[PDB]
Structure formats: C-alpha cells, structure tokens
Design a binder for this molecule. Structure first.
Ligand SMILES: [Fe+3]
Ligand SMILES: [Fe+3]
Ligand SMILES: [Fe+3]
Ligand SMILES: [Fe+3]
Ligand SMILES: [Xe]
Ligand SMILES: [Xe]
Ligand SMILES: [Xe]
Ligand SMILES: [Xe]
Ligand SMILES: [Xe]
Ligand SMILES: [Xe]
Lengths: 512, 162, 384, 512, 384
C-alpha cells in the first residue's frame, strides 16, 4: 500500500541549478593562454546531467553493437565489400579516429577555458562523446580486421600510419590544430570549421559511399556517431556567443577563423575528394559538386551566416580556397599512388569506366592524369617484376615532390593542374617549402609553431625497404608489403621487390 | 641508421651517462636547448634526433634534481638554484613591457629554451605558458594581414630562394 | 531509391567478382602488437592503446618527429614538460575494470534508471514519514548539500588533465574519474530536488548550501584545499594523485563514509545513503585505476621508481596539511548535531578507519611515513 | 578507502541453498491430478537465480532488437523476401506463438507439480522463457506487418486464424496438448516430444528456409529463441528422472509417452513439410529426408535412447508414424489450397521448377498432385472471374474431406496417396470421424476429452462469404480477402467474388 | 556455401522480381483491432493482447468452440469454473508500467549488475566495520533470514495462477508478481552469503533462519497464513488478491518497511536496506497491476462490480484474521531487541502507517469497512 504519488527527478530539474555550481575565488580562471574572455553566465543548449548523458548514449550503443554482432556478422558483411573500399576504410576510420581522439583533449581544454558552469558542462559532454567516437572508429577497424578480406593495416594503423606522408597532414588538421594554440583558435579548427564544415557532412557522405560499395559496417557505426554531432555544433556556436561581447572579438576572431578555415580545407579539399573518387568502385557524386555545396553554400553561406550577429564573417581566403579546389584531389592522388610503398593500404589505378567517369566530370582529366596512369601501367607499376615505382618517373621527368612546411600536404608544382605556386625560404640554416600565401604568412609570423620534419628530411639518404622494415610495414608473413599498387589477390609486392628497386630518398630542397 | 635508433642517439645517451652532478646535467640540457631547439637554434644538424635526445637529457636532470633538492626547493627552485616565482614574474613582466611582437617572440622562445622542465618546476612553467602566450598572441594577431608578404619576408629576415 | 552493394544483385555481383579467394593476411587481430597486461589481449586494450599519436620522444610513443602545429611560443601539443613524473612508457597504465566508453555508459545508465525506479518506489512507499525533520532540513539540505561543491571542485580539477594526459589509457581513466565526480555533485542536488517534491516547504535552491560552502566555517579549509587542487596546480599528475590519493581519500572518505553514511541512518534516512552508495562505489572503482597508474606504473617504474616516489611523497606532504586542515574544520559539524547523536569515541574510531585505510591503500605504496596517531590527534583538535 | 578485497556473490553461490527453501507441511502437494510422484530431492541442471536469468536474456534481447531496428531496417529486410515466404511466416510465427504462450501455463502447472525447490526453479525459468518467446513470435509478425509487403494476416492472425481448419490442429498439439491432462502427459507433449523432437530442430530449420528466401528477420529472432531451448530439454529430461523411481512409472510412462508422440507427429508431420515445401520458392532440403533424420534418427534413436535407463522405450506407434508420413504433407496441401478462402494467408500453386523438384524428390508426385494442380489452374482457380474454388472439384469428384475428431487434422481418405483409413462411429446421437488407430483408441477410451466441434459442424448450412465476413477475414479496404489462391500483386479475390460462388458448407458425416 | 536470398545476386533477383508494386494492405499495424487503454496502442498491448486462444465462452475471447483436448473427466484447458470472479472481458487488464518480457528483464538485469557493483564497493569500503554485531548475527541472520521463507511461500502461491490465468495480460502480470517474490527471497540469501564472505565465522547455511521460520514463535502465524494462501486456495484470483491486497499489503509491508527498513539503520546496517529498497520498489510496481486488475477491471466491472466486490470483501474478511494473527505474533520480535531500540509509541505509529496505507490503497476500493483502531489494537495485544 502506502501514500504519495510515485515521483522522481529528471535531468532538466537538476540542470536548472547547474549554472550556480561554480563559485568565485581569485584564481578561478583558465590555465590556458587566450586573447579572449568567455563570458561567465554563458548558457548551454542541452540540459544534460552525467547519468542521463550515459543513458542516451547506452541505448545507441545497444542498437549499434547489436547490429554488428548479430545480423551483420550473420550476413558476412565484413567480407562482401569492394576491395577498394576495404582499403579506403583503413584510412577513413583510423584517420577519423585520431580526430575523435584529439577532440577529447581539445574539449578538455575548452572545458578549462569556459568559466560558466553550463558552458563547461557542454564541452564536458563532448569530451565524453569524443571518447565514444574514438572507440567507435577503433571498432570499425577492429571489425574489418577480424572479419574482412584484408586485415593488414586495419589491424595496426596506429603504428603503420607513421610510414606515410598523408598522415602528417591529418595530424595538422585533426590533432595539433585541435589542441595547439589559443583555445578559441582550436575551437574554430575543431567545431566551427572542422565539425560544422567537414566532419558533419563527411560522416554521412561516408555512409553513402560505403553502402554503395557493399559496406554496411561503416553506416551502422558512423550513423550512430552522427547522432552526437548536434551537441558539438552547439558547443562551437556557444564558443562564439561566449566571447562575442568582449573587445578582443572584434580584433581577433575573424583572423583566427580565417586561419582555421584555411587550415582545415587545405587538407580536406584534396584528401576527401581523393578518398571518395579514387577509393571506391561505385561513385555517389563528383567531388567538385560536393565541395561546392558543403563549403561554399552550406557552410560558407548558411552556417557562417548564422554567426554574423556575433561579428563573424566569411573567411577572406574562401575565394582562394574555391579556386584551388577543382583539381586538388586529382593532383594529390598522383603523389599518393607514386608513393604507394609508404602507405598502410592498397591502391588501384583507375579502370576504363572510371577514366571515362573522370573525363566526363572533369574535362581534360585524361590528357593529364589519364595518360600518366597509362604510362605508369606500361612501365609496370602493378607488377612486382618490373622494378618500377612511379616515384622513378617523377625523378626521370624532373618533377620534385615537396611537403608544405605548414599543412604537411605533399605537392608537385611542376606537374599540378591546380595551384602550381611554390615559395622556398632559407632561415637560420634551414630551408622551408610553402604551397600557398596563407600558410606562408602563418610560418613567417609564427615560425616556432611550424617545425615539423617531413618525410624527405627524416628519410633522407635512406633506402626505401629499410624504412618500411623498421616501421613494420609488413604483413604477418614478414615479407609481403601491407601497401600495394593494385587491389588484386595475387602478384603482391614484397620487401625484396622494393629492395631491388634501390629507391633512396633525397631531400628535394637540396636542389636549391 | 634508423629512425628510432641510430648512431647519433647512441652517441648522446653515452655522453648523458657521464653527467654526475645536477649543475653539469642542467648546463648540458640548457646548452642543448640553445644549440638544437626552436627556429633560433644554433644548428640544424640534429633536426631528426634532438627531440628524443632532449628527453633523455631531461631524465638525467630530473633524477639528479630530486636527489639534490629538499622538498620545498624541488617545488620552488629551478635546477640552477633560482627562485622560480621570481623568474616567472620577471619574465612575464618583461613580456608585458614588450613594445612589439618581435621583442615578444624572443622573450617567450628564450624563456622556453632556458627554463623548460626539469629546469623550472612545471607548475611555475605552465603558469608562464599561460601568461606569456597570451601577450605574444595579442601582439601577433593584431592586424595580422596588413603587412604584405614581400615586407613580412624582410621583417622575418629570410633569404628568399624561391 | 538507393541501391546498396550488399543486397543489389548487380552491384553485389561486381563486388563478389573482385574479392580474393581468401583473406590477404591471416592476422585478424587489430592491436596484435600491443603488449597485453593480462593473459590475452582484451577489447578494452585493443580499442584504446596507441590511439594517442605520440612520437618516440614522449616515453613509449610509436610515432616520429615533431608535432605539426604547436602553441605560439613553441609549446608542444603534448610534451614531457607538462608533469614532473617520468616513466619508461606512458602507455603502461590499465584501468583494472577495463572501462572503455561502452561499459562505462552501460553501468552508469543502469544506475540512473534504477535510481529513477527507487525514487518512484520510495515516494510511493511513504518512507519519508519516519525521517527526522531536523536531519532532513538542516543536515541534508545545508551540510550534505554544501558537499556538492566539494565534489564539483574535484570534478573541475580534472579539466587540465583531460587536455594534458600523456596517453590514451591515462586520459580515459582520468575522464571517467572526473565524470563520476560531477555525477556525484548532481546526485546531491537530485536528492534535494526530490525532497522539494515530496516535502512541502523544502527549498531545492542551492542558495543555502552554497552560502554554507563559500562562507561557512565547517567547510572553510575544505574549500580552500579544493580551490588549490583545482586552480593552483598546473601538473596533471599532481592534480590526479593529490585529489584521489590524498585529499579525497582522507577528507572525502571521512565526510561521505564516516559522517553522512554513518549518521544519516540514525535519523531515519535511507535516502542519502542510496546516493552515497553510488559515491562510494565510484570511489572504490577509481581507486583501482589511481593505484595502477601511480603505484604499479609510476611508483614502481623499472627506471624511475625512486624518482617518482620522491615526487609523490613530496606532493603527499604538500597536500596532507591542507587536507588535515579540511578535516579539522569539519570536526566543527559534530557540535551542531542533536545531543546524543555521537560521542568522541565513535568519532575517533571513524577517524582511525579513514587514516588506516589511507595508509594501507596509498601512503604505504610510496613509502610515505604517515603517523596515524599524529594525524588523528591533529584532526581531533577541532571537535567543537 | 579500503580494508578488504572487493567481493560479491553469484547465482550459483545462492543456488547452493535453494533446495532448502521449500519446507514441510501437510498440504504441501500439487493441486493437479497426476498418476505420478515427482521425487522431492530432484535437482536441476542450471544453477540460476531470478536476477542472473534476467541478465542472460537481456543481453540476448539487446543484440536481437539492435539488429532488427538498426541494420535490418536500413537494409529494408522486411520487404526483400519472397512473397510466398512472407505468407508462410504469418502462419509459422503466429502458430508458434500460441505454442510459446500455452507453454507458459504448462510450465506453471509443472512448477506446481514439482516438489523439489530446484525442479520447481527449472520449470520457472521456462515459464519466463516462454513469455519471452511469445513476445518474440509476436514481434516477428509485428515487424513484417509494419515493414513488409503484405501486412494483412501478420497484423491480425490472433483473430483471423480462427477462420481456418489448420488452426484447430495447432491448438491440439501446442495449446491443449501442453496443458490439459496429467502434468506428466503435458510435459511429454511439451518437453520430451514437442520441444525435443519438433520445435528445437524446427526453429533452426525455419532460419535456414527463411535465409534462403531472403528473410533475415526470422533468423535474428528465432536464433535468439534457440539459445533458451537447452534449458527446456533439461526440464523434460528432469521430469522423467523425477518420476522414474516410483511404481507408477512402469505402469504409465510409456503409454503417456506414446500418446504424446503420436499427438505431436500427427500434426507436425504433414504441416511442417507443407509449410516448408509449398511455402517457399527456394528449397533447403526435401521433407522426407528431414523427417526421417529428426524423428527416426535424432529423436527416436539418440534422444530417446538416453532415457532408456529410466524405463523409457521408443513409442510403439513410431513405425505407424513412418508408414503414414511419406505423402502426408502433399496430401494436406491439396486440402489447405482447396480451402484457401478460410485462411489468413496467400497460397501459390507450384511453379514449373517446383513441379520438377517435387517429382525428382517424390516420384509419383506429378501424376497425382501435379495433374490436380494443373486441372485446378486450367479451371481458373487463380482467377477471381472463374467462379471456381477447388472445394468444388472435391464435391464433383466425390472426395469428402473429414476432420479427425481427436487431432483436428483434415483428411481425404478417398483421394489420399498416404493413409486411407476412415472410422466413423455414432455415440449417444453424435457421429465421430477418425483417421487412425491411435486417435480412435484415445476417443473410445476418453470420449469426454475430445468433443471439439469441427469447421463443417460449426459452418454447417452457412454460405462461405458470410463466415469470412463475420470473422473479419478482409483487408483494410473491407472488400479484398486476406487469403488468396496466388501470391501476385494483382487480381486479388474479393468477398463478392466468393459470395457469387454460393458455396454452402455441409457436414460430411451426414452422408452416412 | 550458404547463399542467402537477401545478399545473393541470383536469388535476390528472383525475389525482387516476384515482389508487388506496393504493400498489399496499407494497414501496417499489428494489433490494430485491440481497444487501446491509452491514447494510442502501445507495443506492450500489441505484443500481448489476444495471444491467449480463448473462445467467446470465456468472457472476451475471440475464438469459437470447445478446446481440442481436455483433462480426463472433461475439465476445460481454461474455463470460467476456475475462479469465483466474473467479468465482461478478461482481456481488459493492463499493467500500468506496461511490462512485457523485454523491459521486465532489462530492469531486473540493471538491478543485478548494480547490486554486484554495490557489493564490490561496500566490501572494499570496509562499511561492515560500524555494523552492530548483534543486529548482524541475530537479526539479519535469523530474523530477516527467516523472512525469505515468507517471500518464497508467497512466490509459490502463484504457481496455480500461472497455469489458470484467463488472459495473457493477467498471466504476464501474475508471473512477474511471482518472479519478483522469488527474487526477493534470493536477495535475502544473497545478503547472508555476502556476510559469510566478509564476516569471519558467519554461517550462510539456511538451517538457522529455516528453523526460526518452521519452529519459532515470531513467524508462526505468518507461516500458517502463507501455507494456507499457497496450498489451501485453489482459486487463482483468491490467491493473487489475498496475497497482494491483504496479507502482503499488511504483514509484508510491516515486516519489510516498518521493522527492518526502519530499524536496521539504527544498527549501522545500510546493507539490508539496499535489498529492502528492491523489495519495496517491487511491491509498489506490483500494487499498480494488482489495483488495475482487482479494482479498475473486476471491482469496477460494468456488469459484475457489485458481485466482485462482495466476493473480494468476503476474501478480505477471510484472510484479514490470519493476517492480523501474523502481525500479532510478529510483535514478539520487539521484546528481543536491545533495550532502547524503539518503543510502543513508534510501533503504534508504524502499525497505523501500514493499516492506513492498506485502507487507502486496497480496502476502500471495494467498500470493505476496516476499523483502523480495532486492527491496530488487535495487533498490539501481542506486544504487551
Ligand atoms: Fe566526434
Ligand atoms: Fe565531434
Ligand atoms: Fe519456447
Ligand atoms: Fe521451450
Ligand atoms: Xe579522413
Ligand atoms: Xe584512396
Ligand atoms: Xe616511395
Ligand atoms: Xe507451425
Ligand atoms: Xe514450418
Ligand atoms: Xe503453405
């Protein structure tokens, strides 16, 4: 029996008093350098408490792991995916994994920066979400390694990623850019630009291409990840709202935003276009179309437009970004393929249908890239017995490949249908190579922030097979390379095939 | 030789093994930082190995410092015997007296080369990072794009090779 | 309508045709290169170890080279310079409970829903009827409520650590240690919100307990210690070790277990203990991880054991005094209790339980010579 | 902090003392009539407590519901199933549902029978498991109704099943056979025979046929149900063990077992093979082989053999069951199809490939059933404008269809390729029709246990459409019948189409 | 190997080709014909209602005709003859908490896993240290231990109802009511098992508490009432109603809430309340279903309200006497408590809480005239 209606208390009823949890003391201030003042009293959109946060995420996990462990496994979904996509997912899942990971630290920094309890609380949920995302991306690679057609790379990307050049650029946008700098600049890189402009649309697009390529594992996980992203957008919006009524905002916000925007697009523009168009059999949409909608229209227009009332304006480098875009991903794949022995994934030359698709969507593609790929195939780039690596063609044709000192994006000025700009400076006994006016200014103004050693500096004078060997770029048989210049089941290249080529790295800037 | 193990790294752990006093270890670490770290380093000869070598030198200084110093000093004195709080405050004061971004970067960068843990206690050092970085950025980020690149290249002092 | 490659006859046939005859590598175990802590590699480890992209220059890192973008001034994204402690490998740590995100939110969610059913049951059962009004109105509302701010401060002390931790395993443990603290602060308010619903005139506003925390005497040194641990410490390990292996292990344990958990029952209050059960469950869970990191990995490090123990003993001494001060001011609360609630004999035994537990579980692990009688006597000095 | 290692208590540590929970008092005895005595020291195989039981099943549920809600729905798995199989599942899931349901009550009766706390506990786990299974079978119909190609029937089988004759037999083996009689006879019908001989192997077989026919929903659910079955077979085995050391066993056990075996096989032998072979497009295995393996080998041989030490012998009616088995399913489908307007599902005539498959596996199939199906198709049985229902062919060719008074199984002795037995008796003003020697003895010896009114008795003198309308056998448009003689999406039969035929039911026994 | 129709190009092509243009019926709602209790049909209702194959001759059945096989003698599988209560439709009942199997086991599993963590935390925290040894060794061990037999008997009272229930909705509620009872009995043993592990010399054997139940004075009339409710009642409704709306509502609520939950805290015991919290949460959950069936559906039946109330009042009188005798004998336990534990004023207040609660929640719903003072005085006669 008894008397009194069953009653309880929910998240909102507790959250109502959360702003009051913080109290005043002289040293109650952020531990991180910043030009800005995050207003105390700043509120958050989602009225969450730790327990309700856990419950909402647990239900999602239930669904996700249920699908993965039961039906998808029974359907052998880890196997029935196009070979090319199995390879792309090694990079997509592990590279995204590092962004999820660094985003945990970034939001810890933002939690520290915020003075209002609600704002700290908003960043806190994202701290927990990014841990969730780290483990989810890790799980995608775990699953493909456990149940797929080629586990190598999926099973050790955390260490095999270190052999190649594309990884350095990923660390710039999704690791260091997220945590090294004024907390606000990091927030712009992470939330306002990174998540709002690239990650949010990318995650869903990835599920589209995955599905097209027979992969139902990625949609299961990535669609679950995307359900948390709304709260992260709010955190980014709140960052701007929190600092907008301070004099520093008028002086600094737009340049931090412009620098963050350039930073993010510099890598994603060529890389994501490359992963989509060249890492798939079935295509969903040409990247030129996608990029314009995502960056120029959706983000550059609408999203940013909602921040105009806080003094935010369109990045001054947006025009430059659009101009450099068109051929960016095509230019990059040439280098990624030429440097295939340095990866932790297998790559393929575009087949006849793809070349036709490329030309139809990018007039002039065949005359430049198409002919080159055909020449490389004739030289025997797919065959272990050829003794040919495309990098050899770059040397024979006087086409040096440089690494941008700031973004880490590889570029070949003399070949590129895109940018073709190159700036080389010598300073205090060291030379630096830049690919654009924005990154050049970043280094000139902040040289001590950009001292990253490039692949050619570290591997200088080293023979390729010894680098691959020391960095564990081999499959379990201890001889066959993880990376390959084709996605077929045989004629796989071995360490000895690489050793016989006797490719010894040289630092290209030494030509100057 | 390799990326993670090579002749130069080997040569350095041997030299580090010979340090037997906090003062000689701290001096070698400080000299190492002036010689091999930041864009202002005296030489780029150790570019591929200095980061790791520095860490090994730091271990030696740390271990010797913990043995040498009493508890209060371990918390409040630098490896060279200076009062950390006094150095922190004076350095920040110089930074706040900086008349432009050029003087400012020299103060911050130099502070790092000289006091990075285990020289100065971490609590004081990171409090310095908090204060110094703020002023450096306030100065650098003001009218960030006003100077044309041709002039900024000259201000920095690069030799344009192109 | 969209055609999926797994089910579309045309696309699947193309996919199937491209597949090799068998997997291209038999090694189907993701983090196979990770040294397992137990007999066989666990999921917790596979999904966590090496997620952090540290280079070899941060002990145990597998990458190479500098970070790509550093702070203005040159400070590294993560660096050895952020903590006094040194180690042969930052990736050594293992949460003994193996908590990665999934099991962590799973358990917390179970506690949340059961909490909801329990309250629904408690209210329907009319169990509030025999709770002493003075205990409820003064002690739970003001004094237990004031403690929310202690836990909140301890929660906030973790912010810098979330940013600076030098490995994935340490970062994950640290984040959960901090998240459990804010949860406890929220559970203290939730209880007050519940009382406001079932008890007419009971005010859930934090005004009273906040004023008690910021301006009262019983929690004066407590607040001073918390403000210090949170905002005066810039070393992520000093923060984590000092909060969990000194301050909370002594003061927090006394307040939660020896005052509220021990005394609320004498006032017909099974409500507060329901929530303290969660707090104590969380304390004991974090302890395992705190001990693994600070003792098993750092304090027992094969090359830096002596060094690390020196630093940890240093921090223990540094924080033991304000911790004692915190306990000492807290002794003042006993004088406010209704006559006959406790006596000096029970308070003394409770103090010894906390000190003895702390010596066995923490102090002894780094050879810190704590004098139990000396500590208890110093605290007893504040009884009235 | 601590002082003592973290400790807890598990199910088994609590179970160690469960047998002692029951205590002695004069009226501590079963409330149900029984010839047997379940030994009060009987132990159970699974050492479970309520909490651990719940956790075990909760883990299974999250996996299952995760698959259904996430991946399977994203895959449109509710739709991409062969039309014939969509229909088959209306019957398979709803009919099995009543079995799970009555099994709850059966185990309640058994829990009351058991005197040992442990034995009661085992039966109790099953009570809860069968509740789980009821909601699971319900969910399968619910899922196909919500997301499938034809919701009618899936959406209301609990009331539309009452129109047809196949449902009557289902209630005998899986409803009344489970709960009406000596608790031990009920246990033999449920556990020793029903689950051990039919359900356990059937559930798995269903997932294979479902998978072959594009159905991934049923495997996800039925594979989950299967994980609980071993506990139930342990219950059946324990029932025998508990009563074996008492004098009553030697006198009665093999008789109750024989009666239970015949009861179950009488319905399942023709029905299962019919649902599999005629209810599918793609075939997994010919029923003749399956039946022989399940009933003769696995069960009658191995399974039963294990109970020999308790005085259990292979049922005396086994050879008779094999004799009548061969053509049983084929003979019955003719009847189900002829009476298609009385169902709650759509039936199809075998296509040309199936006809070839049937003749290949059942020589003589074509000249009997093949000819009949071809004649019916020629007469326009699939066409609503034909004015023909196969029931009419039976009437024209003098082949009365009867309903066995005991098993409720419909039989046509004059046309059957299998058994032709027909025994008709008049007793106290009423006639009774039997199809076999075993059921005849059951009625003669226990007439009051078998008074079930058959469809011809209930529908006597009624026009077909009036019966279908009253019992809600229509689709949502209130015109189209749920049941159909084809599985195509066009030219569906209407209530008026049936009314125009003026088919009025006659009680076949009135001809004697 | 196994080709699946959903993924196999050739097989899927065949299936896809046979598919209709759109679904053959737009009514995609299973259970659409069931009358919703609430705004819209719930999953609970859809998956449960009409699963029982009753014919129209058992109130509310949708089928027709006799059962296919009955008991020897002719007893129907299910029939009106198995209970005195009558209704317009046995399918009207709805568990207000809407529990079908999935949510029921989900919640219990959460409770099981949190119980495990709580115990791990309690043992690690050394909380037993302040528990009174006499209360622990005598009261929890023997007296609370003995109560396990009461709950076990109550669980067993449900066996016949599991077999005889006349609808799916009543059967599911009934099974869950019984399953919670056996769960409680096991939780009492679980505690004794935990105590045996953390307290040297504590014996988890049930011999002592069992002898207290089968031979002691304190639980004599309780055991007698339980034995009768379980084995002397052959009417499934009399059993469920008299167990939940008479005996357990008065005696069980007194023992769990007014004796143990009220007094255990006075002996430094937060362990027993952790489990009693589960029992009280379960009791309050069951109450809503018991009330819906017996009052909303049966007692308020548009045709049989007056009849059903007459029968339920008859059962209340029938079982109130042995329930009062149960409480009366239980009063003897107060004399065994250490002097000063409680008093006649507290005991009287607690009795009135139980009685008033019972009158409000059960007795008044059927117009049963209970005299609160007469009942309390009748019980207090076993005290002094
Ligand atoms: Fe994320
Ligand atoms: Fe995010
Ligand atoms: Fe079952
Ligand atoms: Fe079963
Ligand atoms: Xe990526
Ligand atoms: Xe790619
Ligand atoms: Xe390369
Ligand atoms: Xe069936
Ligand atoms: Xe079947
Ligand atoms: Xe069928």
């Amino acid at each position: 029996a008894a008397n009194r209606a069953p009653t309880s208390v929910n998240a909102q009823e507790v959250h109502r008093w959360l702003q009051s949890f913080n109290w005043d003391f002289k040293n109650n201030r952020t531990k991180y350098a910043t030009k800005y003042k995050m207003a105390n009293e700043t509120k958050e959109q989602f009225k969450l408490i730790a327990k309700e946060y856990a419950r909402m995420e647990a239900v999602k996990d239930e669904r996700q792991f249920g699908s993965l462990q039961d039906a998808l496994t029974r359907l052998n979904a880890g196997v029935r995916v196009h070979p090319k996509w199995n390879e792309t997912m090694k990079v997509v899942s592990n590279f995204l994994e590092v962004g999820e990971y660094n985003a945990i630290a970034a939001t810890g920094m933002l939690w520290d920066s915020a003075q209002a309890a609600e704002q700290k609380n908003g960043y806190l949920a994202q701290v927990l979400d990014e841990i969730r995302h780290t483990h989810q991306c890790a799980y995608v690679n775990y699953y493909f390694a456990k149940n797929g057609q080629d586990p190598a790379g999926h099973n050790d990307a955390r260490r095999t990623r270190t052999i190649g050049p594309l990884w350095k650029g990923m660390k710039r946008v999704f690791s260091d850019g997220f945590i090294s700098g004024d907390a606000v600049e990091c927030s712009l890189n992470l939330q306002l630009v990174g998540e709002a402009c690239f990650t949010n649309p990318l995650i869903v697009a990835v599920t589209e291409w995955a599905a097209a390529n027979g992969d139902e594992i990625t949609p299961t996980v990535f669609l679950s990840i995307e359900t948390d992203e709304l709260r992260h957008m709010a955190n980014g919006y709140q960052t701007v709202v929190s600092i907008a009524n301070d004099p520093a905002s008028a002086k600094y916000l737009n340049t931090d935003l412009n620098n963050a925007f350039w930073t993010q697009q510099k890598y994603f523009t060529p890389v994501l276009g490359m992963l989509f168009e060249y890492g798939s059999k079935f295509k969903v949409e040409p990247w030129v179309k996608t990029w314009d909608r995502w960056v120029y229209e959706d983000w550059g227009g609408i999203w940013i437009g909602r921040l105009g009332k806080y003094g935010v304006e369109s990045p001054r480098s947006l025009k430059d970004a659009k101009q450099d875009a068109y051929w960016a991903h095509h230019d990059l794949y040439l280098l990624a393929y030429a440097l295939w022995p340095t990866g932790f994934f297998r790559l393929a030359l575009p087949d006849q249908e793809e070349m036709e698709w490329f030309e139809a969507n990018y007039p002039g593609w065949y005359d430049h890239y198409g002919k080159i790929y055909e020449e490389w195939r004739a030289r025997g780039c797919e065959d272990p017995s050829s003794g040919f690596i495309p990098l050899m063609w770059f040397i024979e044709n006087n086409h040096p490949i440089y690494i941008d000192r700031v973004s880490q994006v590889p570029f070949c000025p003399s070949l590129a249908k895109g940018a073709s700009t190159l700036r080389v400076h010598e300073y205090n006994g060291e030379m630096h190579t830049f690919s654009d006016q924005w990154g050049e200014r970043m280094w000139l103004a902040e040289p001590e922030r950009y001292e990253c050693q490039n692949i050619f500096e570290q591997y200088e004078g080293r023979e390729l097979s010894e680098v691959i060997a020391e960095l564990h770029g081999l499959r379990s048989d201890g001889k066959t390379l993880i990376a390959q210049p084709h996605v077929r089941g045989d004629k796989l290249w071995t360490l000895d095939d690489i050793k016989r080529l006797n490719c010894v790295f040289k630092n290209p800037v030494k030509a100057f | 030789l390799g990326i993670h193990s090579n002749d130069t790294r080997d040569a350095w752990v041997n030299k580090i093994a010979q340090l037997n006093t906090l003062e000689k270890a701290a001096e070698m670490l400080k000299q190492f930082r002036m010689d091999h770290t930041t864009p202002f380093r005296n030489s780029y000869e150790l570019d591929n190995d200095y980061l790791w070598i520095e860490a090994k030198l730091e271990e030696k200084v740390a271990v010797l410092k913990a043995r040498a110093f009493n508890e209060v000093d371990f918390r409040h004195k630098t490896a060279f015997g200076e009062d950390a709080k006094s150095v922190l405050d004076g350095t920040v004061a110089k930074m706040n007296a900086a008349k432009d971004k050029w003087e400012a970067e020299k103060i911050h960068i130099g502070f790092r080369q000289a006091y990075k843990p285990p020289i100065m206690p971490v609590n004081y050092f990171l409090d310095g990072e908090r204060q110094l970085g703020t002023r450096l950025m306030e100065l650098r980020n003001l009218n960030y794009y006003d100077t044309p690149l041709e002039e900024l290249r000259k201000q920095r002092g690069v030799r344009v090779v192109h | 309508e969209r055609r999926r490659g797994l089910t579309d006859p045309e696309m699947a046939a193309v996919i199937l045709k491209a597949l090799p005859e068998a997997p291209l590598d038999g090694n189907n175990k993701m983090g196979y290169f990770v040294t397992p802590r137990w007999k066989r590699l666990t999921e917790y480890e596979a999904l966590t170890v090496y997620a952090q992209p540290n280079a070899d220059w941060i002990a145990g890192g597998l990458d190479w080279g500098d970070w790509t973008q550093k702070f203005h001034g040159g400070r590294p994204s993560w660096g050895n310079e952020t903590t006094e402690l040194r180690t042969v490998d930052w990736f050594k740590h293992r949460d003994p409970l193996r908590r990665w995100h999934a099991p962590y939110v799973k358990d917390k969610a179970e506690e949340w829903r059961y909490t909801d059913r329990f309250l629904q049951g408690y209210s329907a059962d009319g169990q509030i009827r025999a709770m002493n009004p003075t205990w409820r109105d003064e002690f739970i509302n003001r004094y237990w409520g004031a403690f929310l701010f202690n836990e909140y401060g301890l929660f906030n002390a973790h912010s810098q650590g979330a940013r600076e931790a030098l490995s994935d395993v340490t970062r994950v443990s640290l984040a959960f240690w901090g998240f459990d603290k804010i949860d406890i602060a929220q559970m203290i308010q939730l209880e007050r919100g519940f009382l406001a619903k079932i008890v007419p005139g009971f005010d859930e506003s934090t005004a009273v307990p906040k004023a008690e925390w910021t301006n009262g005497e019983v929690y004066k040194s407590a607040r001073l210690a918390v403000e210090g641990l949170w905002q005066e410490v810039f070393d992520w390990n000093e923060s984590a070790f000092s909060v969990h292996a000194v301050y909370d292990a002594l003061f927090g344990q006394f307040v939660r277990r020896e005052f509220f958990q021990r005394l609320a029952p004498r006032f017909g209050d099974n409500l507060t203990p329901f929530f303290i059960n969660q707090a104590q469950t969380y304390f004991q869970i974090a302890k395992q991880g705190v001990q693994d990191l600070y003792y098993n990995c750092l304090g027992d490090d094969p090359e830096f054991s002596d060094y690390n123990r020196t630093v940890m003993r240093n921090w223990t001494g540094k924080w033991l005094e304000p911790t004692i001060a915190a306990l000492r001011d807290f002794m003042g609360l006993f004088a406010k209790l209704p006559a006959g609630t406790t006596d000096k004999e029970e308070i003394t035994a409770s103090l010894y339980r906390v000190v003895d537990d702390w010596i066995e579980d923490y102090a002894s692990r780094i050879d810190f010579k704590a004098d139990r009688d000396q500590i208890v006597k110093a605290v007893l000095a504040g009884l009235k």
